[PDB]
Design a protein around this ligand. Sequence first.
Ligand SMILES: [Ca+2]
Ligand code: NA
Ligand code: NA
Ligand code: NA
Length: 305
Amino acid sequence: DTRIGVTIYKYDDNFMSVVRKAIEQDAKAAPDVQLLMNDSQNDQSKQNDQIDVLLAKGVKALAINLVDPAAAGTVIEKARGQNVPVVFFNKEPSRKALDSYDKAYYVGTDSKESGIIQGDLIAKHWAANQGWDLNKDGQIQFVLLKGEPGHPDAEARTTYVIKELNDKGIKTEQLQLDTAMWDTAQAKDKMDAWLSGPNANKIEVVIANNDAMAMGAVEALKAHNKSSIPVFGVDALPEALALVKSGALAGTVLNDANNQAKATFDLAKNLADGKGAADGTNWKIDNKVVRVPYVGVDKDNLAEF
Ligand SMILES: [Ca+2]
Ligand code: NA
Ligand code: NA
Ligand code: NA
């Protein structure tokens, strides 16, 4: 069987756990492929040792989710010894590293696109629901529940949901913006304070950097009999999709783990077989990179889940 070595930066990450399982499913579906999977336990030195072991097993391709993006050159130089192709995924190597090897590729998507897709989702529903503009001023008065300060996904989602709305021509007015540390209970307590204060009846849209905080806000809204106010999240978690179905959550955003897995597997298998990376597929490889769009989820495409 053709062996493909895979390193996941750490198995105790929810998103990469979904990607990992999906890649394992995709390989199971390819009878002539054997996946050699590894948990790097958030230690690049351990990942490097794991790659030395994989190369001693004759893998024909490596799919590597780096712990440290700056280690891409080290990994490429190890793979080059046996001319083994490397498909990096989810953590992006530098452009210099990708350009240094003809058989290096990347599959992943900048986190700011999750804020841009959320902003487009809110614009889509705002334009379709005039009644949400409680003061009829054409602007969205919102509150935002931020992830942990300084976390790259909290910073990007907070900055870009608002830049995207404003770039689509929708002015916004930030009535409140605080962190709830990605947590449902903290978000319920923060939203409850806002609903007990001066802005309670002026808030038109609640924006959260993830679904857990969106769900805490939905609970506070129900407690205050203010469920008329729409809430948007990010993650498309199953418990959040159940609230999209019930009408309690207006929308959320999928980070498409299945397609990151599929693109990584399809490119790695083609390269292991000595074929063009995208042969037989419709992936777009632009300067060695496949981008996998985040996707807005609401009642239009909820049946897909
Ligand atoms: Ca308004
Ligand atoms: Na996560
Ligand atoms: Na991403
Ligand atoms: Na609501």
